Amino acid sequence: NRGTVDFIASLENLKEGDLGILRKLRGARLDEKLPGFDLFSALWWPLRQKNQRAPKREVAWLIAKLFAEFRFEQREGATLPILMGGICRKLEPKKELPRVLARFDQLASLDIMQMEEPLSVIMGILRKHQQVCLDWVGLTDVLSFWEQEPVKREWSDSFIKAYKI
């Protein structure tokens, strides 16, 4: 969907200083710090003007902070339930696999304002296994409509399909 592609492109065009500014704002809200608010407004407001179906402020802020921390390369078809699920085929089934699965499954009982730390640990698990690509646009689209059952069903089904291979 147009509106998210340009948002991710603008995020990928940032330089070291803006990435550090967003990095130092992790775990914080949009209103308390002014430089982060100004940077987010400059990056986001024209997109909301031009496109009505642009991502909401909370999801965009969360995605910006996550991208600033992790800095993955955008690639279509590399969504989270595939890389996580292809990784889960190399762990010990008895002990490590349930521990990873519980952390992956905990996301279904949290709202968009509490999905920073679990996503952080999931992306750290990804980074520990030499992963350099991720689908940011797809992740944003899923996170926008996280309160719908078919979205979660498709998420889990994709995870299972990737895992059973």
Place this chain on the structure above:
Amino acid sequence: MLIEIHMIQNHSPANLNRDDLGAPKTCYFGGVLRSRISSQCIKRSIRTSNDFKALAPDIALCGRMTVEAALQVAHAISTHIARPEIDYFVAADDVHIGESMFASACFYKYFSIDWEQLVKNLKGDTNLAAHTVGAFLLAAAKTNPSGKQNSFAAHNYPDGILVEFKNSPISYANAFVRPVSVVKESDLVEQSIGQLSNYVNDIRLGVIGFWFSPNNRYPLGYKHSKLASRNIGNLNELVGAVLDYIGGFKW
């Protein structure tokens, strides 16, 4: 004429009616399993109750042994998918794990009353029939089955009532063919009432009615539509309006 009553009621986790195996009663609708409360439980729940005790009445409404009762009660059905649950319990000794079944659901209830049959059963009396209709409405509004209530104190009240005077009997179960899926910006009762509203928004396009919600908590129609002739926030005022339309009697 026929008076039709539609009720939407949400219940807390409880077990108000179970089968021989102890599990809550169920049914099949819309390609899924739904919770069910039997008709002969709602009847004998409204009947034989202390509140309802307010030409012998209570027989004209519900007959006994060719009495030709004038009250029709349907089977309560759920607006979503059934979600049975198991509770594991043990017994202490103060000096063996057992399991029990329970469920929570939102129910749609349908009642019908034939005015002419009620009048004929009362031997021409017309004020007594109106009093009986009002008493039945009050009793049905404030009564629940006496199941495992000592362990599940489920005494919730209905969140929406609709009274209609259609020419032919018809139920609005077809408004719940698609099970209700809860979204963040709404709740279950609101979505059920919206689904009901988008079944009388149609039909008329392709009669009158009175809508009642507690203090206008849930208004019929998610717009400024006139799908309801009158919206009333008090049960007694709803009874009075129905009494007036029946032919102008005072409650």
Place this chain on the structure above:
Amino acid sequence: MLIEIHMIQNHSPANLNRDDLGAPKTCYFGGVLRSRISSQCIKRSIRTSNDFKALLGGVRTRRLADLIQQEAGETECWKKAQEILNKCGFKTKMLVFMSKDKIKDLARIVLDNSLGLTEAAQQVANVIAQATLAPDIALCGRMLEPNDKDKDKKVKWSNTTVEAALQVAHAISTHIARPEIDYFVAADDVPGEDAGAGHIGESMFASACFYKYFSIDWEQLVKNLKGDTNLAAHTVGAFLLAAAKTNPSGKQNSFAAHNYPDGILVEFKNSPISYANAFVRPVSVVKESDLVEQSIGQLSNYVNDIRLGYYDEQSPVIGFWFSPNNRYPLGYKHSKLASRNIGNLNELVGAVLDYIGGFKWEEVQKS
């Protein structure tokens, strides 16, 4: 009349009630997952509390032979006790719930007598049936069913049913459930080769804000305890105090969740009404306010809607709202829903006793 008690209580991360697998109990409400505390757990915690020991006059056990034996210095009364109970119909052993003094004295005198086994069993059955004088028995009821397959055909049983006077609902969370897992590793004091990578354990815990509902019928409570009345008032007061200041004893040695309720509402009605539907929509925390304040606000909104809805001028209802030192008002903006807002628990108990009748708590603490 009917006494209705509603409570809002927030608990620290703990595990009070757990299932067979060792996880906190859960349920489905409003289409979403909520934490659950079972009703029997709350009833047992209240029954065996320090504020109720003055009225704990009933025992529920299957080892009645040991109790009968303990009512004897040196006489051997164990095998005969088991034989008599077997002829009674308690042949796994059946749980028996009844008063302590009656079973002790009467079983000791009847069992030790030199009489026939059938007659002794009949007298024991009659004594067991007629021993229904205890506040806990009146509150929780009783249902005894002798086994007709392996009981003496000569004996005959009487009525053994006591209708309950208390209704307790399962506690449910006002928000969505957030189960959590903690990993533990046991250490060894003496150094050595040690184990391998280590045996990591799993303990499940959760934190939630619960809504609690209790209903008490005064007429049935009086009828259960016979024409006595002061004992009923003492039982009501002790039950209120115990429910206010008692928690289940789960993993309390590692999760000391000894929190107290933040809001109590006591109403006097003629028919039971539950305010659970105030939390069909889960409570979401925003940057302003906290969980308890939002829960109390939603409860107040639902109470106002119910009061302005089903209302009859021929039977008005009244109640008292209690918050510690008046820190969480019900009508936050303008509504005076409650009549006699009270900032002290003992004052609330006194007001409840006064409305029930001409009762002083000091006077009724003698039955």
Place this chain on the structure above:
Amino acid sequence: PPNTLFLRLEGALQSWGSNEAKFALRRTADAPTKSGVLGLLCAAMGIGRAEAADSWLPKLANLRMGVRIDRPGIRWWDFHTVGAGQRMRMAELKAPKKPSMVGAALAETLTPSKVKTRAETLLSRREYLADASFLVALQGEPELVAKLSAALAKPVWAIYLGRKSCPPSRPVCEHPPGFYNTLEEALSAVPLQKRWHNEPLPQILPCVMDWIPGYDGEHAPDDAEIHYDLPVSFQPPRHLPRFVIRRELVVGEDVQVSRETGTSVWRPKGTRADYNNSEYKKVRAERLVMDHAACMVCKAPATTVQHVNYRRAGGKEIPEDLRALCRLCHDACTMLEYGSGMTTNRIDPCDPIWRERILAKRKEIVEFRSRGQRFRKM
């Protein structure tokens, strides 16, 4: 003039009892029975049980009957109990001294105290069809068809689906009468209706018909069955056998499919107004004109518009949910609603209860905002 009339039988639950129910086990048939349909018509017209047997049931018996199974339900069972907490009536009576008197003579001496009751609980299991739909076509004289349709338009008594706890889900007189030569054409005339856009649809619809005798004689074929559902009386019940055949119709060539013609999912209303719609710019310019281009807090020149409420979005926008504001006040209001969950009702600058907050936020901006960061847009 029309010679056939149509009935639609649809509901959440329905039952049509069979001849294999003589005890507490009450089973149901796969298709609606002729006796049940005739009883429904009699109830709609308003004839009692003792009057239907006299020149009203023989007239309706001559009609030809055919049922088309649109969708079949699932067989479900219900556990029923009778008389718990009460006493049930027994049929035991004292034997008479002589066999001279019995029946009506002995019934005149019956007293309320002569009956005998026993405390017990009767158990039973009853069968229902869940989510089933049927179409019935009755063919015969045109005057009778017109009378039946007129009676079905407004029923005298309440009509159900075999059991009183089964109210209809669709009107019984949905399809108007027509003229057809054979039952097959009449059953193929009525289309087949869907309930939502994506649902399984039967490829072949079974049909159960009466067997026409044809010419005189013509013994019944080898696939004909015997159904004991020809009504002769209703009090006491009395049924007669009849011959019944089964056929099929394949959809897409003789039975058509109708569209959804409705909306199933409710969903909330529409927020997220558009900032590029011409109507929004028009109403924003009008609102700026009304406010004399003055901010509503600091009375500075105004350049932006704040939405007080979000009742309407895009299509309709009255110039009464908007307020004129400058850059600093608009930014403060934006940062004062980031995580409050206001949804519909937003901050109204005219309300004094917000003033002390708003100015405070403004101060922060004047202390920390860098003009070199808004410039050089990153």
Place this chain on the structure above:
RNA sequence: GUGAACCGGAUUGCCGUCAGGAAAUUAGGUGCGCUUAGCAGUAUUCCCCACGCUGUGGG
């Protein structure tokens, strides 16, 4: 007014007592933001009304 009408699967129950994820890690190596300009010595100052063939008064 239909194998139909009249029609409760009801009563009783704590899953309580046991536990350190711990030992060791520099994110370092290179980089001009630079070329430029009176808030003033004028030749129409955006609109309106009244008196004259420029002077008053309002925005």
